[PDB]
């Protein structure tokens, strides 16, 4: 699907004749399932049918359930997206720490390089140069924590020295919101690939279901920070709408200009193929 449908209104959803059925007192609308990419439920007054849920699982459409605050609560994860998943589990168990640390190191290098590109586009030569120096200084096992230092210098230089990632401000709220949406799309792509989402490529000790999808969503984080930086003066609602405009906007992949969902799908495909083939080629995404 190419469409992201967001329902903030009370209504009933049903499935008839391969068409999503939106039924409300004021109006009724039918949207085909093949066009819909992502289904987002932003309120708690929405009603759906388990048959529609089943058809969304067969259609492989990501379903996201939000809270009364409209922040996302829980998303649907299909058990079997494709038969190739059961065959892929053996490969994931057979993966090597050299391949995991190599691919993760290259991905972190791409993220820091994209931050240096964002500061270069923002015309900060000292900060872009320092982040570039940490990029050239990144090493395996990350003994120097130049990724965390790159993040601290990044947000401190963008939003000011008094700013911090641990603050409760709507800036960090919107950052965690965009990281949750991008984490949901990347997690859904990892479900499409079939490999375990809980196994990360950087640290064996940390156990989280979103670790892998986080490692894959690292390079695309500066995309959120741009709109957060531009709309930081606007209210959190308008910031959220501008964050929803990211799905409509297009970005330039190395091959051509493609949509965000296609870049994430192809990027994750090349990452999985590179992990199973032990680093044949590493996909690089630049702003």
């Amino acid at each position: 699907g190419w469409r992201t449908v967001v329902v903030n209104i009370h209504s009933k959803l049903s499935y008839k004749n391969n068409h999503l059925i939106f039924r409300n007192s004021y109006k009724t609308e039918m949207i085909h399932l093949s066009e819909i990419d992502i289904l987002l439920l932003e309120t708690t007054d929405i009603v759906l049918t388990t048959m529609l849920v089943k058809r969304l699982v067969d259609e492989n459409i990501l379903v996201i359930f939000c809270d009364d605050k409209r922040l996302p609560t829980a998303f649907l994860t299909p058990y079997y997206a494709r038969h190739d998943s059961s065959l892929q589990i053996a490969r994931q168990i057979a993966w090597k720490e050299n391949v995991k640390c190599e691919v993760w190191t290259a991905i972190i290098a791409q993220k820091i390089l994209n931050q240096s590109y964002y500061l270069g586009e923002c015309s900060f030569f000292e900060k872009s140069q320092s982040i570039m120096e940490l990029y050239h200084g990144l090493e395996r096992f990350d003994p120097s924590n130049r990724e965390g230092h790159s993040a601290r210098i990044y947000f401190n230089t963008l939003f000011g020295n008094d700013f911090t990632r641990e603050s409760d401000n709507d800036i960090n709220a919107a950052l965690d919101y965009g990281y949750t949406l991008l984490l949901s799309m990347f997690a859904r792509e990892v479900v499409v690939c079939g490999c375990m989402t809980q196994i990360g490529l950087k640290h064996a000790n940390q156990f989280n279901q979103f670790n892998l999808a986080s490692d894959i969503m690292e390079p695309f984080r500066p995309i959120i920070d741009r709109i957060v930086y531009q709309n930081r003066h606007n209210n959190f609602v308008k910031i959220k709408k501008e964050l929803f405009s990211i799905f409509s906007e297009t970005y330039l992949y190395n091959g051509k200009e493609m949509y965000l969902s296609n870049i994430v799908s192809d990027y994750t495909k090349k990452v999985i193929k590179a992990l199973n083939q032990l680093g044949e080629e590493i996909p690089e995404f630049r702003i």
């Binding site: 190419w2 469409r3 992201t4 449908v5 967001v6 329902v7 903030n8 209104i9 209504s11 939106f22 609308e29 949207i31 932003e42 309120t43 609602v237 308008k238 709408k241 929803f244 405009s245 799905f247 409509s248 949509y259």
Partner: peptide
């Protein structure tokens, strides 16, 4: 042909 479909308040 719209990428983002809003059913609800249009913000």
């Amino acid at each position: 042909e719209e990428r983002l479909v809003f059913l609800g308040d249009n913000y």
